[PDB]
């Protein structure tokens, strides 16, 4: 009745010596697995020995005030609310209306996103990890900066970002208006997909920002100013002329000073948005945030911003514009962009796969209301098709059913090349990926898919093929999913646009 | 980092009314998502509204004694040890050798695996759940059984399982030999992939079993007896014919009777394998086991077993066999099987993608020796090509560099269809998947990939495209990984096959 | 109707093991009155005994609330043997379903429950007839995803502990006849309404 000792405890040294393997391979590095048969070099591409692991997926976003068609919009009701808060705290006759104050209050958001963007470029460059070779150059390439310009001209970069914080910090914006705090939370922060040391990184970069473009008696028109994309090796002179183009109409201007001083008198100095200062010791560390990951997982990309120089055959006058005119819609702030654009004046046939009802996927089984409504923020569903003009139209445009305080334009992923010299590879994609009929892009699409599934809460993919004439649905792993129709997402969007632009109590 | 929004606390009623969402969709049935754009029916296949979540992945295995081509093998060392304990330390009989006793002990394992197989068939059929409509019919289809037969003949199935466990008690086998405990624990458990309510289920099913064959004085074989596959719809009479065919050459053999009485005398009645009885109240709930998941991840499917009726041009004598002959090879037990067979007389050229070194990734950052040795049990790496007997040969065969106590032949995944009946779909696949150049293979392959990535610790895939003449490597989400070469995995296989066939009930090493 | 069918075949099984020197009506007259061939339950006792348990197992695929006393009343009625005077060789009352409600789905234009007639007291039906009746009853229920969604919803809403549990029987399971003056007060002042009307009537 005596249990004898097992084999593994009778020879523990044999077990511990056979199983001593080197784990924790550094990412940012090409790995060749080698051959197990070694005669298989006669089977050249039929044997895959490469092992590339990506590190950065940058979510490329556009900040939005929400959808707006009339004065009953939540941005216009918020303009009314904040204007009667500011006007009833400032003694005197104002010269600006409610729409001028809300357009100022959105231009200040674009300034603060610019400051967080250049401060992110600065604070990324000091990150080092031996087991992550993507730090810091892949993060800098994903933000569209030349990485050597930041190391060579470090003091000039610090002066530029501190001067942006000084010159944009001269304007006042309410701190208890969570739009600024949310956009700062997105633009300041590196997010791991998993709480490990060799984790993949998510970032948020603006695709464009809103430039003020004063018009006079015919109103106010926030225009797009495009940010540099990943792969552009932009230096400090390019970010300087971008900052100078963003502030050329409001830096030494009297109306912006009057509106800023009125916001500074209405909300106290403790009630203003504070810009972070940057020294040579400022570092942002990658943090684990499941709310970030939840809204990245349910993000749906809407496509490229339509510009005034963008050529669209059957769609004239569809450029993205936050407008204001007393002649149109009784002086309401108007913003209703059409989606499904990518440049390239033709139909991107893959956006037809975005016409299904989305799947909102969460982990676990108990979901609070705050988690559910935070996971739907980057989600945008199409509702109808935009109507062309001329009976000859190459692209296909879509109107949404509302959207949050930001929309996703793109995702950019940074991995290592499997070919020598194993430099960084840059892949830009929507949720919808078209795979045309050529022998080159099948293995390339499979490499993009295997790269994407390394990211723990990656956005759900939709893949269409050329010869198949067929889209495949959500390429993602689901745990506890529900199906969202456009009306539920529209209600959540209206609630969250109202909550971001909310002012405190007094009058 | 993100102070919480005070608007949500001041208006929690609006937040609760806006986020009342139907989560916990039961898995096992088709769901349509609908249309965000109502006019998108004009773009018929360019809009996907289907959602087919799979439930069952059955791992189809072959039980092995390890690789054996000389007397220095783990199975031959175990044969020597158990023959010394049975024949000499206890007064055993002298009409049989060590290879005969070891092949009796190997033939008993197929009986134990068959008992666990029909016991899992019986325990599955009483499982019904509102949250999982795959239960129990998809598990019963994946095991090869007609699911209406086990419902209509539940008492007959339930008593046949007990009769198998009773008639297996005519043969004695040692209980401290953890080979039997491992195979019984594998082929009976229902293994859940994530430990949630409607998670995915992994099973282990024998592809074949080893049937005992006596050649008289010129040796002793173990030949393959194929089990039913996941579309076969086999009744109880087929499983009774299989069990009668398995114990046909064992109950009338007096060599087996002498060896059985010798093992009974040497180990005692208390130290034998006891196949326990089941009653009508016997249920198996699915369990969470991260060692099983670490086995299923990094598993390597070796292909179909080769039979003596299998047609392989250029390879006439490559059927899988556990053979001993006193004239041949010092009287050693020989199991040297060729791998890479796909059940057809041609080259499955996706097995060329199994010729690179494997990746073994584990959860976390601190892996114990027990965890690393457990996670490599179903991994099998090819080492060389087999030499074709001639110059014309359509299939390409592979010799391994050792393997564990079981090799994976296949995986069978059960899912629901996306077309209008929405029935159960049965797909069988290797780790290697060939996507031939055809207009309908890419979307089907993408549906296969998306069904596979629902399973958490799934096997790593290797996809070959015929249009590109190019394979892609391990299609899996990685973690803390290593690169394994053939000698390291061979050393781990040597360690585990030595530890499984060790009987601590013996008087060895004290 | 599933629960009533389970209590019906469970009473058929529990009756056939009852033999008494003082009452030679037991068990054949009770088995004839239920519509069953009494030699079939004797010759195929293990098959009957396992079919009753399989009915109780396959009924557990559907969730139904246990505090709804409709189910408890019908199960208590159609399983008991009720004695009329509480003496040794007293008279026996039973309750047998004339028909059961079979589920019918018409799609978007509605949903029916149609009659499924049970065997009458001269019919001499074997186990295969009761198996055909049970297969005809759950035929339109196990393949319906409306029923699957509603079953999962009742399971989620009430929990597994708050569902109707059809309990298992073993070979030692006996029903002795009981004295119940509430059942007798139901049988007294009962009013027979006549035969059910069928679509072929």
mmCIF file of C-alpha atoms in Angstrom, chain B residues 120-417:
data_model
loop_
_atom_site.group_PDB
_atom_site.id
_atom_site.type_symbol
_atom_site.label_atom_id
_atom_site.label_comp_id
_atom_site.label_asym_id
_atom_site.label_seq_id
_atom_site.Cartn_x
_atom_site.Cartn_y
_atom_site.Cartn_z
ATOM 1 C CA UNK B 120 -17.138 9.247 -23.771
ATOM 2 C CA UNK B 121 -19.750 8.465 -26.449
ATOM 3 C CA UNK B 122 -22.134 7.413 -23.669
ATOM 4 C CA UNK B 123 -21.375 10.370 -21.393
ATOM 5 C CA UNK B 124 -21.737 12.911 -24.217
ATOM 6 C CA UNK B 125 -25.266 11.890 -25.258
ATOM 7 C CA UNK B 126 -26.814 12.949 -21.924
ATOM 8 C CA UNK B 127 -25.468 16.519 -22.259
ATOM 9 C CA UNK B 128 -27.989 19.164 -23.346
ATOM 10 C CA UNK B 129 -27.588 22.865 -22.646
ATOM 11 C CA UNK B 130 -29.616 25.938 -23.676
ATOM 12 C CA UNK B 131 -26.400 27.933 -24.252
ATOM 13 C CA UNK B 132 -24.693 25.365 -26.527
ATOM 14 C CA UNK B 133 -26.730 23.743 -29.300
ATOM 15 C CA UNK B 134 -23.664 21.826 -30.478
ATOM 16 C CA UNK B 135 -24.269 19.587 -27.464
ATOM 17 C CA UNK B 136 -24.558 16.674 -27.898
ATOM 18 C CA UNK B 137 -24.960 15.978 -31.618
ATOM 19 C CA UNK B 138 -21.793 17.656 -32.908
ATOM 20 C CA UNK B 139 -19.610 15.821 -30.385
ATOM 21 C CA UNK B 140 -21.342 12.579 -31.391
ATOM 22 C CA UNK B 141 -20.873 13.252 -35.112
ATOM 23 C CA UNK B 142 -17.184 14.098 -34.573
ATOM 24 C CA UNK B 143 -16.687 10.754 -32.811
ATOM 25 C CA UNK B 144 -18.186 8.934 -35.797
ATOM 26 C CA UNK B 145 -21.409 7.796 -34.155
ATOM 27 C CA UNK B 146 -24.990 8.146 -35.313
ATOM 28 C CA UNK B 147 -26.343 10.479 -32.590
ATOM 29 C CA UNK B 148 -29.916 9.193 -32.811
ATOM 30 C CA UNK B 149 -28.654 5.652 -32.146
ATOM 31 C CA UNK B 150 -27.216 6.558 -28.738
ATOM 32 C CA UNK B 151 -30.462 8.323 -27.823
ATOM 33 C CA UNK B 152 -32.711 5.469 -28.975
ATOM 34 C CA UNK B 153 -30.475 2.734 -27.490
ATOM 35 C CA UNK B 154 -29.137 4.386 -24.349
ATOM 36 C CA UNK B 155 -29.520 1.315 -22.114
ATOM 37 C CA UNK B 156 -27.802 -0.911 -24.679
ATOM 38 C CA UNK B 157 -24.879 1.532 -25.050
ATOM 39 C CA UNK B 158 -24.670 1.971 -21.271
ATOM 40 C CA UNK B 159 -24.495 -1.770 -20.678
ATOM 41 C CA UNK B 160 -22.087 -2.375 -23.584
ATOM 42 C CA UNK B 161 -19.580 0.052 -22.025
ATOM 43 C CA UNK B 162 -19.768 -1.853 -18.730
ATOM 44 C CA UNK B 163 -19.428 -5.192 -20.530
ATOM 45 C CA UNK B 164 -16.283 -3.899 -22.264
ATOM 46 C CA UNK B 165 -14.879 -2.908 -18.864
ATOM 47 C CA UNK B 166 -15.787 -6.348 -17.487
ATOM 48 C CA UNK B 167 -14.297 -8.441 -20.305
ATOM 49 C CA UNK B 168 -11.135 -6.315 -20.265
ATOM 50 C CA UNK B 169 -10.576 -7.540 -16.692
ATOM 51 C CA UNK B 170 -9.684 -11.009 -17.980
ATOM 52 C CA UNK B 171 -6.246 -9.551 -18.820
ATOM 53 C CA UNK B 172 -3.899 -8.121 -16.202
ATOM 54 C CA UNK B 173 -1.928 -4.920 -16.814
ATOM 55 C CA UNK B 174 -0.001 -2.766 -14.310
ATOM 56 C CA UNK B 175 -1.616 0.394 -12.981
ATOM 57 C CA UNK B 176 1.552 2.339 -12.156
ATOM 58 C CA UNK B 177 2.462 2.298 -15.861
ATOM 59 C CA UNK B 178 1.287 5.842 -16.670
ATOM 60 C CA UNK B 179 0.913 5.049 -20.390
ATOM 61 C CA UNK B 180 -2.568 3.671 -19.672
ATOM 62 C CA UNK B 181 -3.551 6.537 -17.367
ATOM 63 C CA UNK B 182 -2.431 9.093 -19.962
ATOM 64 C CA UNK B 183 -4.357 7.467 -22.813
ATOM 65 C CA UNK B 184 -7.486 7.047 -20.681
ATOM 66 C CA UNK B 185 -7.275 10.659 -19.483
ATOM 67 C CA UNK B 186 -6.841 11.879 -23.068
ATOM 68 C CA UNK B 187 -9.527 9.890 -24.868
ATOM 69 C CA UNK B 188 -12.276 10.482 -22.275
ATOM 70 C CA UNK B 189 -12.084 14.162 -21.344
ATOM 71 C CA UNK B 190 -14.058 17.004 -22.860
ATOM 72 C CA UNK B 191 -11.633 19.907 -22.919
ATOM 73 C CA UNK B 192 -12.785 23.510 -22.952
ATOM 74 C CA UNK B 193 -10.615 26.090 -24.665
ATOM 75 C CA UNK B 194 -11.135 29.242 -22.589
ATOM 76 C CA UNK B 195 -13.105 28.324 -19.374
ATOM 77 C CA UNK B 196 -16.229 30.358 -20.135
ATOM 78 C CA UNK B 197 -19.875 29.411 -20.609
ATOM 79 C CA UNK B 198 -20.167 28.793 -24.357
ATOM 80 C CA UNK B 199 -16.523 28.058 -25.072
ATOM 81 C CA UNK B 200 -15.147 25.753 -27.740
ATOM 82 C CA UNK B 201 -14.615 22.037 -27.086
ATOM 83 C CA UNK B 202 -11.563 19.890 -27.861
ATOM 84 C CA UNK B 203 -11.717 16.090 -27.983
ATOM 85 C CA UNK B 204 -9.253 13.266 -28.610
ATOM 86 C CA UNK B 205 -10.379 10.343 -30.765
ATOM 87 C CA UNK B 206 -8.289 7.333 -31.842
ATOM 88 C CA UNK B 207 -7.770 7.200 -35.589
ATOM 89 C CA UNK B 208 -6.877 3.513 -35.334
ATOM 90 C CA UNK B 209 -6.154 0.944 -32.641
ATOM 91 C CA UNK B 210 -3.478 -1.753 -32.506
ATOM 92 C CA UNK B 211 -4.961 -5.198 -33.172
ATOM 93 C CA UNK B 212 -2.928 -8.145 -31.888
ATOM 94 C CA UNK B 213 -1.664 -10.654 -34.462
ATOM 95 C CA UNK B 214 0.175 -13.893 -33.679
ATOM 96 C CA UNK B 215 2.430 -15.321 -36.394
ATOM 97 C CA UNK B 216 3.540 -18.289 -34.293
ATOM 98 C CA UNK B 217 7.278 -18.837 -34.037
ATOM 99 C CA UNK B 218 8.147 -16.260 -36.735
ATOM 100 C CA UNK B 219 7.060 -13.254 -34.695
ATOM 101 C CA UNK B 220 4.139 -11.202 -33.412
ATOM 102 C CA UNK B 221 2.465 -8.142 -34.929
ATOM 103 C CA UNK B 222 0.303 -5.248 -33.906
ATOM 104 C CA UNK B 223 -1.679 -4.231 -36.987
ATOM 105 C CA UNK B 224 -3.948 -1.171 -37.430
ATOM 106 C CA UNK B 225 -7.689 -1.389 -36.811
ATOM 107 C CA UNK B 226 -9.276 1.779 -38.189
ATOM 108 C CA UNK B 227 -11.861 3.566 -36.044
ATOM 109 C CA UNK B 228 -14.915 5.309 -37.558
ATOM 110 C CA UNK B 229 -14.408 8.802 -38.953
ATOM 111 C CA UNK B 230 -16.474 11.896 -38.285
ATOM 112 C CA UNK B 231 -19.080 11.371 -41.012
ATOM 113 C CA UNK B 232 -19.666 7.655 -40.680
ATOM 114 C CA UNK B 233 -22.845 7.437 -38.505
ATOM 115 C CA UNK B 234 -22.045 4.084 -36.916
ATOM 116 C CA UNK B 235 -24.563 2.276 -34.716
ATOM 117 C CA UNK B 236 -23.878 0.184 -31.610
ATOM 118 C CA UNK B 237 -23.584 -2.991 -33.712
ATOM 119 C CA UNK B 238 -20.557 -1.543 -35.533
ATOM 120 C CA UNK B 239 -18.801 -0.744 -32.246
ATOM 121 C CA UNK B 240 -19.658 -4.235 -30.994
ATOM 122 C CA UNK B 241 -18.141 -5.718 -34.162
ATOM 123 C CA UNK B 242 -15.041 -3.553 -33.610
ATOM 124 C CA UNK B 243 -14.686 -4.705 -30.003
ATOM 125 C CA UNK B 244 -15.210 -8.343 -31.011
ATOM 126 C CA UNK B 245 -12.561 -7.944 -33.717
ATOM 127 C CA UNK B 246 -10.182 -6.414 -31.175
ATOM 128 C CA UNK B 247 -10.352 -9.138 -28.501
ATOM 129 C CA UNK B 248 -10.735 -11.993 -31.006
ATOM 130 C CA UNK B 249 -7.048 -12.967 -31.027
ATOM 131 C CA UNK B 250 -6.555 -12.320 -27.297
ATOM 132 C CA UNK B 251 -9.133 -14.387 -25.388
ATOM 133 C CA UNK B 252 -8.246 -17.649 -27.151
ATOM 134 C CA UNK B 253 -4.471 -17.260 -26.963
ATOM 135 C CA UNK B 254 -2.796 -19.181 -24.157
ATOM 136 C CA UNK B 255 0.357 -17.107 -24.549
ATOM 137 C CA UNK B 256 -1.824 -14.147 -23.568
ATOM 138 C CA UNK B 257 -3.406 -16.233 -20.803
ATOM 139 C CA UNK B 258 -0.022 -17.205 -19.358
ATOM 140 C CA UNK B 259 1.231 -13.605 -19.601
ATOM 141 C CA UNK B 260 -2.003 -12.339 -18.021
ATOM 142 C CA UNK B 261 -1.697 -14.750 -15.098
ATOM 143 C CA UNK B 262 1.968 -13.790 -14.720
ATOM 144 C CA UNK B 263 1.178 -10.055 -14.590
ATOM 145 C CA UNK B 264 -1.647 -10.833 -12.128
ATOM 146 C CA UNK B 265 0.739 -12.819 -9.925
ATOM 147 C CA UNK B 266 3.612 -10.321 -10.168
ATOM 148 C CA UNK B 267 1.655 -7.126 -9.521
ATOM 149 C CA UNK B 268 -1.252 -8.449 -7.452
ATOM 150 C CA UNK B 269 -4.937 -7.735 -7.944
ATOM 151 C CA UNK B 270 -4.718 -4.345 -6.214
ATOM 152 C CA UNK B 271 -1.969 -3.136 -8.561
ATOM 153 C CA UNK B 272 -3.826 -3.651 -11.837
ATOM 154 C CA UNK B 273 -5.644 -1.306 -14.195
ATOM 155 C CA UNK B 274 -9.271 -1.058 -13.076
ATOM 156 C CA UNK B 275 -11.678 0.114 -15.760
ATOM 157 C CA UNK B 276 -14.350 1.578 -13.510
ATOM 158 C CA UNK B 277 -18.069 1.088 -13.977
ATOM 159 C CA UNK B 278 -20.591 3.707 -15.068
ATOM 160 C CA UNK B 279 -24.193 3.988 -13.936
ATOM 161 C CA UNK B 280 -27.113 5.971 -15.339
ATOM 162 C CA UNK B 281 -26.071 8.992 -13.225
ATOM 163 C CA UNK B 282 -22.581 9.217 -14.784
ATOM 164 C CA UNK B 283 -21.849 12.605 -16.385
ATOM 165 C CA UNK B 284 -18.707 14.243 -17.756
ATOM 166 C CA UNK B 285 -18.668 17.954 -17.582
ATOM 167 C CA UNK B 286 -16.133 19.762 -19.800
ATOM 168 C CA UNK B 287 -13.029 20.847 -17.924
ATOM 169 C CA UNK B 288 -10.398 23.544 -18.284
ATOM 170 C CA UNK B 289 -6.904 22.045 -18.568
ATOM 171 C CA UNK B 290 -4.030 24.301 -19.717
ATOM 172 C CA UNK B 291 -1.722 21.287 -20.123
ATOM 173 C CA UNK B 292 -4.114 19.746 -22.675
ATOM 174 C CA UNK B 293 -4.338 23.124 -24.427
ATOM 175 C CA UNK B 294 -0.539 23.353 -24.478
ATOM 176 C CA UNK B 295 -0.524 19.912 -26.106
ATOM 177 C CA UNK B 296 -3.087 20.881 -28.755
ATOM 178 C CA UNK B 297 -1.203 24.062 -29.487
ATOM 179 C CA UNK B 298 2.155 23.070 -31.076
ATOM 180 C CA UNK B 299 0.718 19.690 -32.131
ATOM 181 C CA UNK B 300 1.817 18.390 -35.529
ATOM 182 C CA UNK B 301 -0.403 16.188 -37.683
ATOM 183 C CA UNK B 302 1.637 13.425 -39.320
ATOM 184 C CA UNK B 303 -1.007 12.273 -41.804
ATOM 185 C CA UNK B 304 -3.029 9.131 -42.357
ATOM 186 C CA UNK B 305 -1.835 5.696 -41.204
ATOM 187 C CA UNK B 306 -0.566 3.428 -43.969
ATOM 188 C CA UNK B 307 -2.405 0.125 -44.330
ATOM 189 C CA UNK B 308 -1.430 -3.015 -46.199
ATOM 190 C CA UNK B 309 -4.241 -2.323 -48.685
ATOM 191 C CA UNK B 310 -3.135 1.305 -49.109
ATOM 192 C CA UNK B 311 -1.834 2.171 -52.585
ATOM 193 C CA UNK B 312 1.481 4.066 -52.482
ATOM 194 C CA UNK B 313 3.447 4.085 -55.735
ATOM 195 C CA UNK B 314 7.147 3.673 -55.021
ATOM 196 C CA UNK B 315 6.512 2.580 -51.410
ATOM 197 C CA UNK B 316 5.217 -1.014 -51.389
ATOM 198 C CA UNK B 317 6.126 -2.122 -47.867
ATOM 199 C CA UNK B 318 5.506 0.933 -45.694
ATOM 200 C CA UNK B 319 2.414 -0.124 -43.720
ATOM 201 C CA UNK B 320 2.369 0.890 -40.061
ATOM 202 C CA UNK B 321 3.238 -2.101 -37.894
ATOM 203 C CA UNK B 322 4.561 -2.880 -34.427
ATOM 204 C CA UNK B 323 6.599 -5.987 -35.248
ATOM 205 C CA UNK B 324 9.010 -8.233 -33.392
ATOM 206 C CA UNK B 325 10.880 -11.172 -34.886
ATOM 207 C CA UNK B 326 13.517 -13.227 -33.019
ATOM 208 C CA UNK B 327 15.593 -13.616 -36.192
ATOM 209 C CA UNK B 328 15.389 -9.954 -37.210
ATOM 210 C CA UNK B 329 17.204 -7.110 -35.434
ATOM 211 C CA UNK B 330 18.248 -8.870 -32.177
ATOM 212 C CA UNK B 331 14.594 -9.639 -31.404
ATOM 213 C CA UNK B 332 13.745 -5.971 -30.889
ATOM 214 C CA UNK B 333 10.307 -4.421 -31.180
ATOM 215 C CA UNK B 334 10.285 -2.290 -34.333
ATOM 216 C CA UNK B 335 7.975 0.655 -34.966
ATOM 217 C CA UNK B 336 9.435 2.815 -37.753
ATOM 218 C CA UNK B 337 6.449 4.454 -39.474
ATOM 219 C CA UNK B 338 6.547 6.743 -42.478
ATOM 220 C CA UNK B 339 4.623 10.005 -42.264
ATOM 221 C CA UNK B 340 3.095 12.452 -44.714
ATOM 222 C CA UNK B 341 0.423 10.148 -46.143
ATOM 223 C CA UNK B 342 -2.875 11.811 -47.040
ATOM 224 C CA UNK B 343 -4.912 8.721 -47.903
ATOM 225 C CA UNK B 344 -4.276 9.056 -51.646
ATOM 226 C CA UNK B 345 -1.724 7.957 -54.241
ATOM 227 C CA UNK B 346 -0.195 11.359 -54.953
ATOM 228 C CA UNK B 347 1.984 13.976 -53.295
ATOM 229 C CA UNK B 348 0.236 16.151 -50.726
ATOM 230 C CA UNK B 349 2.557 19.080 -51.346
ATOM 231 C CA UNK B 350 1.438 21.034 -48.280
ATOM 232 C CA UNK B 351 3.457 18.541 -46.199
ATOM 233 C CA UNK B 352 6.481 20.300 -47.726
ATOM 234 C CA UNK B 353 5.557 23.202 -45.415
ATOM 235 C CA UNK B 354 6.125 20.872 -42.436
ATOM 236 C CA UNK B 355 9.854 20.711 -43.242
ATOM 237 C CA UNK B 356 10.870 23.829 -41.307
ATOM 238 C CA UNK B 357 11.655 23.895 -37.611
ATOM 239 C CA UNK B 358 8.709 24.225 -35.275
ATOM 240 C CA UNK B 359 7.709 26.996 -32.886
ATOM 241 C CA UNK B 360 6.615 26.112 -29.346
ATOM 242 C CA UNK B 361 4.841 29.040 -27.677
ATOM 243 C CA UNK B 362 3.458 28.871 -24.146
ATOM 244 C CA UNK B 363 1.308 31.196 -22.008
ATOM 245 C CA UNK B 364 2.993 33.582 -19.634
ATOM 246 C CA UNK B 365 6.690 34.157 -19.081
ATOM 247 C CA UNK B 366 7.678 31.466 -16.529
ATOM 248 C CA UNK B 367 7.442 27.917 -17.892
ATOM 249 C CA UNK B 368 8.210 24.985 -15.619
ATOM 250 C CA UNK B 369 9.996 21.868 -16.841
ATOM 251 C CA UNK B 370 6.764 19.886 -16.427
ATOM 252 C CA UNK B 371 4.931 22.433 -18.587
ATOM 253 C CA UNK B 372 7.572 22.381 -21.358
ATOM 254 C CA UNK B 373 7.644 18.576 -21.323
ATOM 255 C CA UNK B 374 3.842 18.418 -21.471
ATOM 256 C CA UNK B 375 3.471 20.944 -24.296
ATOM 257 C CA UNK B 376 5.575 18.862 -26.730
ATOM 258 C CA UNK B 377 3.634 15.589 -26.530
ATOM 259 C CA UNK B 378 1.841 15.857 -29.877
ATOM 260 C CA UNK B 379 4.629 17.712 -31.697
ATOM 261 C CA UNK B 380 6.302 15.675 -34.438
ATOM 262 C CA UNK B 381 9.005 17.042 -36.733
ATOM 263 C CA UNK B 382 10.053 15.373 -39.960
ATOM 264 C CA UNK B 383 13.741 14.576 -40.361
ATOM 265 C CA UNK B 384 14.388 12.992 -43.788
ATOM 266 C CA UNK B 385 12.493 11.853 -46.841
ATOM 267 C CA UNK B 386 11.883 8.141 -47.176
ATOM 268 C CA UNK B 387 13.766 6.414 -49.991
ATOM 269 C CA UNK B 388 11.332 5.350 -52.754
ATOM 270 C CA UNK B 389 11.692 1.728 -53.863
ATOM 271 C CA UNK B 390 12.285 2.621 -57.502
ATOM 272 C CA UNK B 391 12.366 5.830 -59.508
ATOM 273 C CA UNK B 392 8.624 6.456 -60.011
ATOM 274 C CA UNK B 393 6.823 7.496 -56.828
ATOM 275 C CA UNK B 394 3.753 9.696 -56.523
ATOM 276 C CA UNK B 395 3.568 10.259 -52.707
ATOM 277 C CA UNK B 396 6.380 11.772 -50.657
ATOM 278 C CA UNK B 397 6.961 10.055 -47.326
ATOM 279 C CA UNK B 398 8.816 11.376 -44.302
ATOM 280 C CA UNK B 399 10.741 9.698 -41.551
ATOM 281 C CA UNK B 400 10.488 11.458 -38.172
ATOM 282 C CA UNK B 401 13.102 12.100 -35.510
ATOM 283 C CA UNK B 402 11.141 10.312 -32.822
ATOM 284 C CA UNK B 403 7.673 10.906 -31.448
ATOM 285 C CA UNK B 404 5.776 10.601 -28.195
ATOM 286 C CA UNK B 405 3.221 8.108 -26.958
ATOM 287 C CA UNK B 406 0.746 9.350 -29.569
ATOM 288 C CA UNK B 407 0.936 11.067 -32.958
ATOM 289 C CA UNK B 408 -1.770 13.314 -34.371
ATOM 290 C CA UNK B 409 -3.158 12.137 -37.696
ATOM 291 C CA UNK B 410 -5.790 14.797 -38.265
ATOM 292 C CA UNK B 411 -8.057 17.423 -36.812
ATOM 293 C CA UNK B 412 -11.781 17.460 -37.464
ATOM 294 C CA UNK B 413 -13.705 20.663 -36.842
ATOM 295 C CA UNK B 414 -17.499 20.761 -36.558
ATOM 296 C CA UNK B 415 -19.272 24.027 -37.334
ATOM 297 C CA UNK B 416 -22.647 25.184 -38.580
ATOM 298 C CA UNK B 417 -23.221 25.927 -42.248
#
